[PDB]
């Protein structure tokens, strides 16, 4: 048990092809993928919550079907977002946000009253954070923590998830051995990698992970 | 601006009276209502297309007009479709639909050749989906994705929309102050609520909003 989520996150982070994205973008793993490696969701959730509380990771709302939470290392996010904002007009607002707000508040989102009254942000500074892509509107009174450049990641991720699921759907009886899937040529549209995508499919229960005497069989869950 | 359509959907979702259908139906909001909260239709349409592609929402065609799009959370669709299916003979067909079709694309409709060849459905399984209310006929060769029990929603919605327009039409010179309309108690025929309906009328441009020294005046369009 101890270190299960931490080990899973580091294993999944190593799969991330960071060279595809904006310099601002830290490697992202999905809570769904952690569940592939730590299938006890109670354990996975408790240890991710501990890492969140101990400052080490940020949870980000990305809004996918099934598990829509991204996981990033806080220090990776901060380093890249700071470098990226250097000598842009939103740099001052972003520096204050990273230095004051992130350590004070571990939530996925921030309230307007919190930002303006507790932290002393001007509306124009909040607008800068939205322009920088560090905040996105959640509702009339709050903003999601966001990752600059995540739009490209979300686009690549959704197209790749559908393409990998299609590999299983196209196979005889809508099932495919893991070794057969991973040994296939990655379609052009799968930019984040087959293994990266398979962990998401297993954790999101878009495929069933069946133990056979031929190894792991991925099966569409039609029953 | 980023997240505007998603934030509008979350705000409108809170207006839905779930207790009206005993949570047999997933909460439904309308693209017209999103236009009330996101009046740049170009931005609203671009962001709704992104959310559709990402799969946290499903867009559903509703037949009362060309561009009547319903908006539901995919997890609410799955939860309600599964509750509705529980111990019914179309359960097998519906499970295959949710596992194979739903995650493949955000499409509003499916061609016959798509259903049989891509998704492996037998006609008997398609008949089950029509009986379940998960598909409705679009034309001789295709089906709309549909929400089980949406018939009752459509009936309440059409009668409510016309009842609220009738309140304005019956008023002197076919215009009524917004505060006066909202300060009415909803006649039994307006089952989805006045505010829910007023956002649809504003967004769909079925009323014109006129600025006056008495507040916003709703005026019926005389073309
Ligand atoms: Cl790389
Ligand atoms: Cl209103």
Curated annotation (Swiss-Prot), chains A, B:
InterPro entries: STK19-like. Monocytes, hepatocytes, epithelial cells, T- and B-lymphocytes. One of its GO terms (cellular component) is nucleus. The keyword tRNA-binding does not apply. Changing residue 175 to K: Increases cytoplasmic localization. It comes from Homo sapiens (Human). This is Winged helix repair factor 1. Disulfide bonds: none annotated. It comes from the Eukaryota. Changing residue 219 to A: Increases cytoplasmic localization. GO terms for molecular function: ATP binding; double-stranded DNA binding; double-stranded RNA binding; kinase activity; protein homodimerization activity. Residues 1-73 are annotated as: Winged helix domain 1. Keywords: Cytoplasm, DNA damage, DNA repair, DNA-binding, Nucleus, Repeat, RNA-binding.
